[PDB]
């Protein structure tokens, strides 16, 4: 046989394609293998080599389906489980989804193939990195967004974490690209030029890691018990099941009282419109404030507005010392970015303030974000003031099941921390709840799938990163910079 003449024909690129698209979802948290999107990104960039832009294009797109097939796989459990779509109507929906994910790295791969054909430095370094970037601006915006499964968030163990606090999370997705295609500009060509650039490249960020971005506040450590009440997602939503789940949270929160500053509950703790709870949150502020400590908790809150029609909002209120509950008070937070076909229909919660006020409760300002909304470091960054303390999440995993979807989402909520340099208080139902350190660290972690509470001493950190203080246009510029050139270089 031969092992050149496969390699040239198009049916084997695309099922290699597909295979180091499959190959580079081994990358993040349930398997964290940091090389593996080295690999998958090697893989991506070597096999568009020498192909016309509709056959990169169809390279690309097997690829990205490569990826987002078993990547993201766990979204069917969100479907069989939760809807009468039979099982072959999920797997088309499961399917679709991937198609559509895939779609903006075959768009990348056409782009890149057709405006740089040829492979040089110019291609691999440079204007793949910054097509790369926009592919991934466009497919987290367009639709509301998805911007999952971005090799990115695999450095937070890996040599390439302490960019995150610099320039970004997305600012590694620029690096990982460009050193990727390096690597495989000096596979496809046996030269060590490209081989050395790209060992240069990224062992540079690896001594930019021992920089801490901030200070430790050893003065105001608070113990935090976040309590999670492993409600089934069956029956939650039930108004059968709504005084049990009050009754096992109130039971499990109330030996914490007077031992722990801070109590957190899961995203929709309290299964019921804010205004019919009344008595029972005004009984629980009372009794807080009597023992001393705060809680923080999930709750859905419908408000009449300006029309005099309800507005559902899917709110964290704070209750306690150092935060009295009010039906009226500034001290909540509505979630902003919803999830599609989980909260409304593109194309029903309402969407509260993209900018919003950081809670305060018992002298402790936190960040909140609501489970999707971890992921979005932009938002988190903007809503993310000097004054913050820890950051707040609260989210409810059980619709993923026991799947890999919890943990990379876990992954993404770790990364926030190591970019913003503040303590991240995660808060799920079922899910993985930790109190995340600074530097993307997990200094505490209970069981998943169970009813537990994690009580711990946590301390607050001051300073701010260079990237929580520029934000993420530096990289833009960076991106917008490389592109032009490349462009530039390309006329001729």
């Known amino acids: 046989m031969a092992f050149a003449s496969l390699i040239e024909r198009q049916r084997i690129r695309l099922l290699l394609a597909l295979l180091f698209g499959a190959?580079?979802?081994?990358?993040?948290?349930?398997?964290?293998?940091?090389?593996?999107?080295?690999?998958?990104?090697?893989?991506?960039?070597?096999?568009?080599f020498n192909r016309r832009p509709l056959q990169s294009a169809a390279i690309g797109f097997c690829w990205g389906f490569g990826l987002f097939g078993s990547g993201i796989n766990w979204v069917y459990v969100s479907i069989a489980t939760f809807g009468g779509m039979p099982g072959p109507v999920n797997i088309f929906l499961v399917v679709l989804l991937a198609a559509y994910l895939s779609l903006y790295t075959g768009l990348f791969a056409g782009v890149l193939s057709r405006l740089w054909p040829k492979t040089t430095w110019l291609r691999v370094a440079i204007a793949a990195p910054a097509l790369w970037q926009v592919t991934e601006f466009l497919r987290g915006w367009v639709?509301?967004?998805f911007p999952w499964l971005?090799?990115?968030?695999?450095?937070?163990?890996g040599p390439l974490k302490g960019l995150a606090p610099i320039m970004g999370v997305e600012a590694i997705n620029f690096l990982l690209m460009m050193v990727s295609g390096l690597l495989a500009l000096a596979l496809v060509k046996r030269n060590?030029?490209?081989?050395?650039?790209?060992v240069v490249l990224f062992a540079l960020?690896?001594?930019?890691?021992?920089?801490?971005?901030?200070?430790?506040?050893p003065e105001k450590t608070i113990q935090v018990s976040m309590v999670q009440g492993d409600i089934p997602q069956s029956?939650?939503?039930?108004?059968?099941?709504?005084?049990?789940?009050?009754?096992?949270?109130?039971?499990?929160?109330?030996?914490?009282?007077?031992?722990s500053s801070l109590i957190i509950w899961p995203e929709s703790a309290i299964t019921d419109l804010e205004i019919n709870q009344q008595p029972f949150l005004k009984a629980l502020d009372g009794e807080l404030r009597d023992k001393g400590s705060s809680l923080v908790t999930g709750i859905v809150d419908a408000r009449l507005n300006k029309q005099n029609r309800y507005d559902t909002y899917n709110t964290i209120i704070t209750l306690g010392k150092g935060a009295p509950y009010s039906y009226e008070s500034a001290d909540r937070y509505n979630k902003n970015h919803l999830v599609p076909f989980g909260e409304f229909v593109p194309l029903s919660f309402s969407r509260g303030p993209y900018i919003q006020p950081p809670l305060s409760a018992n002298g402790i300002e936190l960040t909140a974000a609501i489970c999707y909304e971890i992921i979005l470091g932009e938002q988190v960054r903007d809503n993310?003031?000097?004054?913050?303390?820890?950051?707040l999440t609260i989210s409810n995993d059980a619709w993923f099941g026991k799947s890999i979807g919890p943990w990379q989402h876990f992954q993404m909520a770790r990364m926030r921390a190591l970019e913003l340099a503040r303590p991240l208080l995660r808060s799920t139902n079922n899910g993985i709840t930790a109190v995340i350190g600074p530097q993307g660290e997990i200094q505490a972690m209970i069981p998943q799938f169970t009813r537990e509470v994690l009580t711990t001493n946590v301390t607050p950190t001051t300073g701010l990163t260079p990237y929580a203080r520029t934000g993420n246009w530096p990289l833009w510029v960076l991106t917008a910079l490389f592109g032009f050139a490349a462009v530039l270089m390309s006329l001729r």
Do not use: H
């Open 23 to 48: 190959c580079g979802t081994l990358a993040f948290s349930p398997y964290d293998v940091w090389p593996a999107a080295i690999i998958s990104l090697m893989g991506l960039q070597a096999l568009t």
């Open 143 to 145: 639709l509301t967004g």
């Open 150 to 157: 971005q090799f990115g968030y695999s450095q937070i163990d």
């Open 192 to 198: 060590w030029r490209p081989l050395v650039v790209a």
């Open 205 to 217: 960020p690896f001594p930019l890691r021992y920089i801490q971005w901030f200070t430790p506040q």
């Open 235 to 259: 029956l939650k939503w039930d108004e059968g099941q709504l005084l049990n789940t009050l009754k096992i949270y109130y039971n499990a929160t109330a030996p914490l009282m007077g031992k």
């Open 384 to 391: 993310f003031r000097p004054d913050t303390d820890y950051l």
